[PDB]
Every structure is written in C-alpha cells, then in structure tokens.
Design an enzyme around this catalytic site. Structure first.
Site, short mmCIF file in Angstrom:
data_model
loop_
_atom_site.label_atom_id
_atom_site.label_comp_id
_atom_site.label_asym_id
_atom_site.label_seq_id
_atom_site.Cartn_x
_atom_site.Cartn_y
_atom_site.Cartn_z
N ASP A 123 0.79 -1.21 0.00
CA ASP A 123 0.00 0.00 0.00
C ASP A 123 0.84 1.29 0.00
O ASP A 123 1.34 1.72 1.06
CB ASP A 123 -0.89 -0.04 1.24
CG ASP A 123 -1.93 1.06 1.21
OD1 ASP A 123 -1.90 1.90 0.31
OD2 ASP A 123 -2.83 1.03 2.09
N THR A 124 0.94 1.89 -1.18
CA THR A 124 1.71 3.12 -1.31
C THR A 124 1.01 4.29 -0.61
O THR A 124 1.66 5.32 -0.37
CB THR A 124 1.97 3.43 -2.79
OG1 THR A 124 0.67 3.67 -3.36
CG2 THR A 124 2.67 2.32 -3.54
N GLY A 125 -0.24 4.13 -0.22
CA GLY A 125 -0.99 5.17 0.50
C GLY A 125 -0.80 5.09 2.02
O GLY A 125 -1.32 5.96 2.73
C1 LIG Z 1 -6.57 6.79 3.14
C2 LIG Z 1 -5.03 6.67 3.07
C3 LIG Z 1 -4.35 8.04 3.11
C4 LIG Z 1 -4.50 5.91 4.32
N1 LIG Z 1 -4.93 4.50 4.43
C5 LIG Z 1 -4.31 3.58 3.43
C6 LIG Z 1 -5.29 3.27 2.30
O1 LIG Z 1 -4.58 2.66 1.23
C7 LIG Z 1 -6.48 2.40 2.73
C8 LIG Z 1 -6.09 0.94 3.07
C9 LIG Z 1 -7.33 0.18 3.50
C10 LIG Z 1 -7.92 -0.75 2.66
C11 LIG Z 1 -9.09 -1.43 3.01
C12 LIG Z 1 -9.70 -1.20 4.23
C13 LIG Z 1 -9.12 -0.26 5.08
C14 LIG Z 1 -7.94 0.40 4.74
N2 LIG Z 1 -7.47 2.35 1.64
C15 LIG Z 1 -8.62 3.01 1.69
O2 LIG Z 1 -9.03 3.64 2.66
O3 LIG Z 1 -9.28 2.87 0.50
C16 LIG Z 1 -10.63 3.38 0.47
C17 LIG Z 1 -10.74 4.03 -0.91
O4 LIG Z 1 -10.97 2.90 -1.77
C18 LIG Z 1 -11.64 1.87 -1.09
O5 LIG Z 1 -10.99 0.60 -1.29
C19 LIG Z 1 -10.34 0.16 -0.08
C20 LIG Z 1 -11.08 0.88 1.04
C21 LIG Z 1 -11.57 2.19 0.42
S1 LIG Z 1 -5.16 3.89 5.95
O6 LIG Z 1 -5.56 2.51 5.81
O7 LIG Z 1 -6.02 4.81 6.63
C22 LIG Z 1 -3.61 3.92 6.82
C23 LIG Z 1 -3.18 5.09 7.46
C24 LIG Z 1 -1.94 5.13 8.08
C25 LIG Z 1 -1.11 3.99 8.06
N3 LIG Z 1 0.16 4.00 8.62
C26 LIG Z 1 -1.56 2.83 7.42
C27 LIG Z 1 -2.77 2.80 6.77
#
Ligand SMILES: CC(C)CN(C[C@@H](O)[C@H](Cc1ccccc1)NC(=O)O[C@H]1CO[C@H]2OCC[C@H]21)S(=O)(=O)c1ccc(N)cc1
Lengths: 99, 99
Positions: B25-27
């Site tokens: 996860d690059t995010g």
């Molecule tokens: C929103 C980002 C800036 C940060 N997130 C990583 C992100 O890649 C998450 C990673 C993620 C993935 C699934 C469930 C929860 C978190 N994906 C996410 O929220 O995606 C949403 C948008 O598209 C949809 O598909 C997936 C969920 C929805 S995060 O999970 O909150 C996170 C924040 C800080 C850290 N250190 C680790 C992870």
C-alpha cells in the site's frame, strides 16, 4: 516516471477543471476527494476505510487528466483525510508496482 | 517483478512465526496489522484514515520477511479491517511506482 516511495507519491491531476494534488494509493480501490465541485447527478456509495464505513457521493464518467492521459473515471466525494487516486484510475494510466 | 493494479496487490509476509496476507500500500505511511501478538515494549500512536483515527501500538525493529528479503521494520498493530504494508517497508525492499 519511476517514483521511489521515500516521499509520499503525490501528483497533480486535473479534475472538473481544477488542478488537485492527490496521493497515489495502491491500497485504495477507489479515487476519493473531499469537498470538490463536480457537476451533475451522483449516487450514494458506502466505502470501508480503516476507521469504518463512510458514506460518499459517487460521480461517474468524470473527465480527468493524469500524467498527461485524458480519461473519464469514477470519482467518490466525501470525508477523507487525504485526496487519493486509487487503483480504478491507476490502472487506466497503466501504473505498476515494481520490486 | 512488475505488478499491474487491476487486482489488489496482496503479498504474504512472515512475521512473528505467522504468515499473513498484506496489501502492498503506497498510501500507507507505515505497515499496520490487526491480528498479531508481538513481543516486548511498544509506544501508542494514532493513525488517520477514512472513517477517522485508529489507535495502534508501534513496535520497532520487528523481524519480517517479504518478497524474499529479511529485514527488521516498524510494525503498527491495531484494529484495521485489512492488513497493509506501508511505505516504510516498501522502501526497505526497493518497491517503486511506474507510470
Ligand atoms: C486513506 C489513506 C491516506 C491511508 N490509508 C491507506 C489506504 O490505502 C487504505 C487501506 C485500506 C484498505 C481497506 C480497508 C481499510 C484500509 N485504503 C482506503 O481507505 O481505500 C478506500 C478508498 O478505496 C476503497 O478501497 C479500499 C477501502 C476504500 S489507511 O488505511 O487509513 C492507513 C493510514 C496510516 C497507516 N500508517 C496505514 C494505513
């Protein structure tokens, strides 16, 4: 470009006529931005983030320009702490994760 | 290797004598895993995402193996619905985005 990941991978896209800085997020299925002005109708969508499920607006067929490609894409608009472009759009531009 | 993004990029990692499936996860600034017990001292942290803040424990210098590389790395442990490895670990294994 080939981007390393020491810094956050932020690029500038054009959307609904505006330039927006967005984080390239391979863990996001979808592209999500807060408080942008997009015209026309939308439908409710529920997305599940790290903190739980959140209601957003889903806009279809939105013209975006990314990395010099002009495409149309689905864009979700709602509470997010970061404006992200997710895999729906990254695949459109042929992005890969290499290691 | 070169991974397209039409699929979620899920890789296995070895950690704590367990094998866990994680999203590359690059995010994510840092790796976060839900169901795991790691030994020793940790510090509390809040991370921010869609759906609000999540309380985690930060463990430093945790031995893991991913993509065939043994490293020690920072791991956050807390109630994420999806386990992810973040830029801290992706950089340790030389992962890059290409478009
Ligand atoms: C929103 C980002 C800036 C940060 N997130 C990583 C992100 O890649 C998450 C990673 C993620 C993935 C699934 C469930 C929860 C978190 N994906 C996410 O929220 O995606 C949403 C948008 O598209 C949809 O598909 C997936 C969920 C929805 S995060 O999970 O909150 C996170 C924040 C800080 C850290 N250190 C680790 C992870």
């Amino acid at each position: 470009p080939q981007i390393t990941l020491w810094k956050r991978p932020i690029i500038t896209i054009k959307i609904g006529g505006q330039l927006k800085d967005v984080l390239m997020d391979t863990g996001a299925d979808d592209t999500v931005l807060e408080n942008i002005d997009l015209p026309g109708k939308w439908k409710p969508k529920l997305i599940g983030g790290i903190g739980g499920f959140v209601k957003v607006r889903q806009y279809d067929h939105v013209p975006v320009e990314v990395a010099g490609h002009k495409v149309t894409t689905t864009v979700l608009v709602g509470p997010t702490p970061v404006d992200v472009i997710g895999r729906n759009l990254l695949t459109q531009i042929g992005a890969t994760l290499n290691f």
